[PDB]
Amino acid sequence: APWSREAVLSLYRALLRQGRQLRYTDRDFYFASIRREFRKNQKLEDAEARERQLEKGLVFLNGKLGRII
Amino acid sequence: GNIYRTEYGLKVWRINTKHNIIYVNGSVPGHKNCLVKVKDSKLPAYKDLGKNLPFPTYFPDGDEEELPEDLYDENVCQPGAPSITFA
Amino acid sequence: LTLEGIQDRVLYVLKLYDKIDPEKLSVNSHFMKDLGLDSLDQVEIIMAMEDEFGFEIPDIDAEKLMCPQEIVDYIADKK
Amino acid sequence: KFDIDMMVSLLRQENARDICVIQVPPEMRYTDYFVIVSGTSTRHLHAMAFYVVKMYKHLKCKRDPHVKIEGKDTDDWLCVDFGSMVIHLMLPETREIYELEKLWTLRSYDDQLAQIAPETVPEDFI
Amino acid sequence: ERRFLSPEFIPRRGRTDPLKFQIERKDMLERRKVLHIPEFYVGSILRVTTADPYASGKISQFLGICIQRSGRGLGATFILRNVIEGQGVEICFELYNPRVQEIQVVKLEKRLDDSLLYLRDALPEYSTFDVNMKPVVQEPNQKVPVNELKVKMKPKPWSKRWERPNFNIKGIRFDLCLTEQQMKEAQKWNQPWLEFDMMREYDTSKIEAAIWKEIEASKRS
Amino acid sequence: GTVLDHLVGEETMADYLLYTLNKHQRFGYVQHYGLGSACDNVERVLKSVAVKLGKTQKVKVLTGTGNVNIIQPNYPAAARDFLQTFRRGLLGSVMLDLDVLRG
Amino acid sequence: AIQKMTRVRVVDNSALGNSPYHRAPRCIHVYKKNGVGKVGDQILLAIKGQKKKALIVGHCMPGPRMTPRFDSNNVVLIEDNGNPVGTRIKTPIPTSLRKREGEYSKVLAIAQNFV
Numbered sequence A: 001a002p003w004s005r006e007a008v009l010s011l012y013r014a015l016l017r018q019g020r021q022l023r024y025t026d027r028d029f030y031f032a033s034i035r036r037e038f039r040k041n042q043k044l045e046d047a048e049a050r051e052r053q054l055e056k057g058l059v060f061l062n063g064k065l066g067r068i069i
Numbered sequence B: 001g002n003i004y005r006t007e008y009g010l011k012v013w014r015i016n017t018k019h020n021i022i023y024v025n026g027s028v029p030g031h032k033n034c035l036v037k038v039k040d041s042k043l044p045a046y047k048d049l050g051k052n053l054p055f056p057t058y059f060p061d062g063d064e065e066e067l068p069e070d071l072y073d074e075n076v077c078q079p080g081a082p083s084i085t086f087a
Numbered sequence C: 001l002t003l004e005g006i007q008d009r010v011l012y013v014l015k016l017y018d019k020i021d022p023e024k025l026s027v028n029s030h031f032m033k034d035l036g037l038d039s040l041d042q043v044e045i046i047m048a049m050e051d052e053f054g055f056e057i058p059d060i061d062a063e064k065l066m067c068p069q070e071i072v073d074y075i076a077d078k079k
Numbered sequence D: 001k002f003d004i005d006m007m008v009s010l011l012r013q014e015n016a017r018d019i020c021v022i023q024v025p026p027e028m029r030y031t032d033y034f035v036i037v038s039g040t041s042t043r044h045l046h047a048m049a050f051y052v053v054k055m056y057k058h059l060k061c062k063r064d065p066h067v068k069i070e071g072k073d074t075d076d077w078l079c080v081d082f083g084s085m086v087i088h089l090m091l092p093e094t095r096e097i098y099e100l101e102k103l104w105t106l107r108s109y110d111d112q113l114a115q116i117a118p119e120t121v122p123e124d125f126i
Numbered sequence E: 001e002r003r004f005l006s007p008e009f010i011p012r013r014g015r016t017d018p019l020k021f022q023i024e025r026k027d028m029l030e031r032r033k034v035l036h037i038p039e040f041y042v043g044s045i046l047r048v049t050t051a052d053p054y055a056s057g058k059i060s061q062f063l064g065i066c067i068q069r070s071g072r073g074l075g076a077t078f079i080l081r082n083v084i085e086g087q088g089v090e091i092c093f094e095l096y097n098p099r100v101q102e103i104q105v106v107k108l109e110k111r112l113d114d115s116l117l118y119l120r121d122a123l124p125e126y127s128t129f130d131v132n133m134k135p136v137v138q139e140p141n142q143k144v145p146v147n148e149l150k151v152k153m154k155p156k157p158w159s160k161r162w163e164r165p166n167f168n169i170k171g172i173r174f175d176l177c178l179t180e181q182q183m184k185e186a187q188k189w190n191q192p193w194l195e196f197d198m199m200r201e202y203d204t205s206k207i208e209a210a211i212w213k214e215i216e217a218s219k220r221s
Numbered sequence F: 001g002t003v004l005d006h007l008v009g010e011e012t013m014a015d016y017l018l019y020t021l022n023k024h025q026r027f028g029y030v031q032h033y034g035l036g037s038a039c040d041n042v043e044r045v046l047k048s049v050a051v052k053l054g055k056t057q058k059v060k061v062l063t064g065t066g067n068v069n070i071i072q073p074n075y076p077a078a079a080r081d082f083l084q085t086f087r088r089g090l091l092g093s094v095m096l097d098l099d100v101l102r103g
Numbered sequence G: 001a002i003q004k005m006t007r008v009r010v011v012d013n014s015a016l017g018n019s020p021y022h023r024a025p026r027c028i029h030v031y032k033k034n035g036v037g038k039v040g041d042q043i044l045l046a047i048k049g050q051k052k053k054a055l056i057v058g059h060c061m062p063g064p065r066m067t068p069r070f071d072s073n074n075v076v077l078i079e080d081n082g083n084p085v086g087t088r089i090k091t092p093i094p095t096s097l098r099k100r101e102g103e104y105s106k107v108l109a110i111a112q113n114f115v
Ligand SMILES: *P(=O)(O)OCC(C)(C)[C@@H](O)C(=O)NCCC(=O)NCCSC(=O)CCCCCCCCC
Pocket: A002, A005, A008, A033, A034, A037, A038, A041, A042, A043, A044, A045, A049, A050, A053, A054, A056, A057, A060, C038, C039, C040, D101, D102
């Protein structure tokens, strides 16, 4: 249904990498937020919302509009 | 109309020495090409500000140094100055 | 390096996890049926072990890990 | 020097749960550092704001303009706007209601924003 | 060989002493030798980059179609209009304001009318432009292209009665929005004597020569 | 009808009338207007009424480019006709003090 | 610009501001001495049978140079204490609320675009 399940897992692990590499923010809240977001985002079954969310996750990972450190 | 009126509290932003021109702040009474009488401000809040002003007047002939073409203000951005970047 | 050190460090880091129930934590502990874990949870387990023991674990082989026995074997033969 | 490091250090003693800091690029034309902080109570929010503004006034920068506390009558939300850093104190409920982190990370790619139509104009009837 | 003089260099008719014009032109040239002001007309797409005083001096950009060039001297202004997020915006930029970092002519064109103020009442498609559009190359030593676009208007009422002869608008398809009776009624305000009144014409040929001499002397200096 | 309808607004009175009809479970209006089924969306009910009795009004809406005149169903006229029908009593007997009498 | 009995357009995503009849709320009081509302002023609206305070973000009337002029009179709803009723703003708003003195940081934070 999504662009790629491997792509989803790679995006999630890269977000975890960025959270670990971050300095100012809080690991607990960052990890809880991303985990809750993924849990609420999964199981949608339409796959168009999920490909849009994959695109938005790619944009967030790139961080050309705003980066949280 | 057509009566004498006075405006108080107008400052000088720029002076052109070559053309003998004063750049007074704001608007002044009268039409264009009219004669206006200018003197130091009479307001009590601006009294005793003529310590550095020429006294009794400026004498270019006896002056040791030649004045710049345009005397600006500290806040005035000169036309030749680069584009202003704020902080 | 100690092989039992790798083994018990993996066992300890798996015990450190909270959501999963530490009921049958063996080398052949099947995450999908014994613990009911999904891909996100197993990747979370991969991160939880890598943060304190790793720095050379790629996803291309972590996605098919599925067991602490594989964890120990991969760490031992990579080191 | 009064910087983002100073802000986070002053919030650590302030017991600032969930300190989120976002670096705003010059494209967004707003500020440099956007900070969201969750406190335990309105009194905690007021104390944190008072402490940070007191430290800012007492530390340095006699030239730059003073900063006013913004949102005193608002118990749930409070804001302070420094020269280039903006800080928002808000309870977790208010953060959930207005989740700003996704808004300021994804410009126009936010959930709420997607759920809201960009622009619509009513047409005629039959 | 086409040599273009900016409109604000031509003063309005009046009794003002020429010395004021001379000094204002000197300041204009001194500002222009620092900030390059490109040649553009009403209907040309412009991207203006400025600095925001109360946003920590951050650089800002705005793109829009020029619909009006008004003012004189240092006070010259031009209005840029765009449609952003389905919402019309217009900004009246000042040419000689030091806040303006740069001005770029994305697309140089000329329209059938002196002012495009009727774009407010026209359809949003004729004023909606992409913000990130690539500037289009202009051939050197080429006549400025003229755009003969005839926009379509929204149903009346409008902001102003653009059909009346005083406006003298030729970039509107009046035959698609008005009836012949309405056109004939609007014709009642025509003033055929006004165009032939030869005492209200302003002669600028004797002034543009001096303006160009001053500009070239300043550039040489 | 003791007070002036316009001083309160026809839309809210129509909404309250629909609410009371739904609470009393009479549903005279659906069969009177040939409506599909019992509804509680006041705007949809008024649109159906305006379709039924052919009323269209042109109004100005606020868009991002300016003011636009559009033809839409005459909701005020539909609400007024609904209220007049209720007051004449074609929609059945009603009791507006049922809840306060019950307690 | 905006004064009493003047129709305004609600720009945030508030459910109260969402009108199913496409009817526009109109101001009934301006919280200024002279009753004329410019950008950043606070007014009162009679919207959906409710009196709600609102903050004007952009107006059609021309203003100072370099300040954007909008083709519609825009407003955002505010509570009695300052917390905005809506959650986000889609249409761009002027940045001059930063310069102007008032409780604007919440609206600037929930805004998306600037002009
Ligand atoms: P696994 O193989 O068991 O997983 C499969 C699952 C996840 C169960 C799928 O079948 C599924 O249900 N959905 C697939 C993906 C999906 O639903 N949505 C895509 C998520 S994209 C995303 O998360 C966007 C990132 C934005 C970052 C915001 C974080 C804010 C931090 C401040």
